[PDB]
Design an enzyme around this catalytic site. Structure first.
Site, short mmCIF file in Angstrom:
data_model
loop_
_atom_site.label_atom_id
_atom_site.label_comp_id
_atom_site.label_asym_id
_atom_site.label_seq_id
_atom_site.Cartn_x
_atom_site.Cartn_y
_atom_site.Cartn_z
N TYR A 38 0.84 -1.20 0.00
CA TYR A 38 0.00 0.00 0.00
C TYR A 38 0.87 1.25 0.00
O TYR A 38 1.94 1.27 0.60
CB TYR A 38 -0.89 0.02 1.24
CG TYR A 38 -1.94 -1.06 1.25
CD1 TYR A 38 -3.05 -0.98 0.42
CD2 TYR A 38 -1.81 -2.18 2.06
CE1 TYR A 38 -4.02 -1.97 0.40
CE2 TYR A 38 -2.77 -3.19 2.05
CZ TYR A 38 -3.87 -3.08 1.22
OH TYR A 38 -4.80 -4.08 1.18
N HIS A 40 -1.76 1.32 -3.38
CA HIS A 40 -1.73 0.77 -4.74
C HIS A 40 -3.04 1.09 -5.42
O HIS A 40 -4.03 1.43 -4.76
CB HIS A 40 -1.45 -0.75 -4.73
CG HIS A 40 -2.56 -1.57 -4.14
ND1 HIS A 40 -3.78 -1.72 -4.75
CD2 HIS A 40 -2.62 -2.30 -3.00
CE1 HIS A 40 -4.55 -2.51 -4.03
NE2 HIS A 40 -3.87 -2.88 -2.96
N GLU A 58 -5.96 2.91 -2.97
CA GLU A 58 -6.45 2.53 -1.66
C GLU A 58 -5.31 2.56 -0.66
O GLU A 58 -4.17 2.18 -0.98
CB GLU A 58 -7.15 1.17 -1.66
CG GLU A 58 -6.29 -0.03 -2.04
CD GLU A 58 -6.97 -1.35 -1.71
OE1 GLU A 58 -7.18 -1.63 -0.51
OE2 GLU A 58 -7.30 -2.11 -2.64
N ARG A 77 -10.30 1.21 4.42
CA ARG A 77 -9.44 1.92 3.47
C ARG A 77 -9.98 3.29 3.09
O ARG A 77 -11.19 3.49 3.03
CB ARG A 77 -9.36 1.15 2.14
CG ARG A 77 -8.95 -0.31 2.21
CD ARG A 77 -7.48 -0.46 2.51
NE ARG A 77 -7.12 -1.88 2.57
CZ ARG A 77 -7.19 -2.63 3.67
NH1 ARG A 77 -7.59 -2.10 4.82
NH2 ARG A 77 -6.87 -3.91 3.60
N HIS A 92 -14.10 -3.84 4.22
CA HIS A 92 -14.37 -5.23 3.91
C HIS A 92 -15.46 -5.76 4.85
O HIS A 92 -16.08 -6.78 4.57
CB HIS A 92 -13.11 -6.09 4.07
CG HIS A 92 -12.13 -5.94 2.95
ND1 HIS A 92 -12.42 -6.30 1.65
CD2 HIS A 92 -10.84 -5.51 2.94
CE1 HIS A 92 -11.35 -6.11 0.89
NE2 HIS A 92 -10.38 -5.63 1.65
N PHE A 100 -15.61 -4.93 -1.30
CA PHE A 100 -15.78 -3.78 -0.41
C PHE A 100 -17.20 -3.24 -0.45
O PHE A 100 -17.92 -3.42 -1.44
CB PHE A 100 -14.88 -2.61 -0.86
CG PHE A 100 -13.42 -2.82 -0.64
CD1 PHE A 100 -12.83 -2.48 0.58
CD2 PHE A 100 -12.60 -3.29 -1.67
CE1 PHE A 100 -11.45 -2.60 0.76
CE2 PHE A 100 -11.22 -3.41 -1.50
CZ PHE A 100 -10.64 -3.06 -0.28
N1 LIG Z 1 -12.25 -5.67 -4.16
C1 LIG Z 1 -11.37 -4.95 -4.85
N2 LIG Z 1 -10.08 -5.32 -4.93
C2 LIG Z 1 -9.35 -4.48 -5.72
C3 LIG Z 1 -9.79 -3.37 -6.39
N3 LIG Z 1 -8.76 -2.77 -7.10
C4 LIG Z 1 -7.73 -3.53 -6.86
N4 LIG Z 1 -8.01 -4.60 -6.04
C5 LIG Z 1 -7.11 -5.72 -5.80
O1 LIG Z 1 -7.57 -6.82 -6.64
C6 LIG Z 1 -7.39 -8.07 -5.94
C7 LIG Z 1 -8.74 -8.75 -5.75
O2 LIG Z 1 -9.66 -8.00 -4.95
C8 LIG Z 1 -6.71 -7.72 -4.60
O3 LIG Z 1 -5.29 -7.80 -4.76
C9 LIG Z 1 -7.14 -6.25 -4.41
O4 LIG Z 1 -6.22 -5.46 -3.64
P1 LIG Z 1 -6.42 -5.37 -2.03
O5 LIG Z 1 -6.58 -6.79 -1.58
O6 LIG Z 1 -5.20 -4.68 -1.53
O7 LIG Z 1 -7.66 -4.57 -1.94
C10 LIG Z 1 -11.15 -3.00 -6.30
O8 LIG Z 1 -11.67 -2.06 -6.89
N5 LIG Z 1 -11.89 -3.85 -5.49
#
Ligand SMILES: Nc1nc2c(ncn2[C@@H]2O[C@H](CO)[C@@H](O)[C@H]2OP(=O)(O)O)c(=O)[nH]1
Length: 104
Positions: A38, A40, A58, A77, A92, A100
């Site tokens: 993070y 990212h 995020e 986040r 979450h 989310f």
């Molecule tokens: N749920 C969710 N995950 C995201 C999104 N953009 C990137 N991700 C990343 O895509 C993968 C599947 O969710 C995870 O690595 C997640 O990162 P994080 O786990 O750090 O959120 C988003 O818009 N929603």
């Protein structure tokens, strides 16, 4: 006081602003912390209706009040863009899988 409610976590405007400032700064310097690297890109798979333009990023906001430094990110986040504009505050908690829900 309770401007943003994440499940049972309660965040004020100052809490969000402080976390957002920390996350934007690391983004600006091109640095990341934590197993998930993070801050990212947040692609908005959930299709939230943000009022600000992409790209989005995020960054974890902690209930303890501390600024995230690579440890356990938790469920909440703050989402910001390249203009350091707040897109929203998501969690979450209450969601299934790695999805989310927006904080109210
Ligand atoms: N749920 C969710 N995950 C995201 C999104 N953009 C990137 N991700 C990343 O895509 C993968 C599947 O969710 C995870 O690595 C997640 O990162 P994080 O786990 O750090 O959120 C988003 O818009 N929603």
């Amino acid at each position: 006081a309770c401007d943003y409610t994440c499940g049972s976590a309660c965040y004020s405007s100052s809490d969000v602003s402080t976390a957002q400032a920390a996350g934007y700064k690391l983004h600006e310097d091109g640095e990341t912390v934590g197993s998930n690297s993070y801050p990212h890109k947040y692609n908005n798979y959930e299709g939230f209706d943000f009022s600000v333009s992409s790209p989005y990023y995020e960054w974890p906001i902690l209930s303890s009040g501390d600024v995230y430094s690579g440890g356990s990110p938790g469920a909440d986040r703050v989402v910001f863009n390249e203009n350091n504009q707040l897109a929203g505050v998501i969690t979450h908690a209450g969601a299934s899988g790695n999805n989310f829900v927006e904080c109210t």
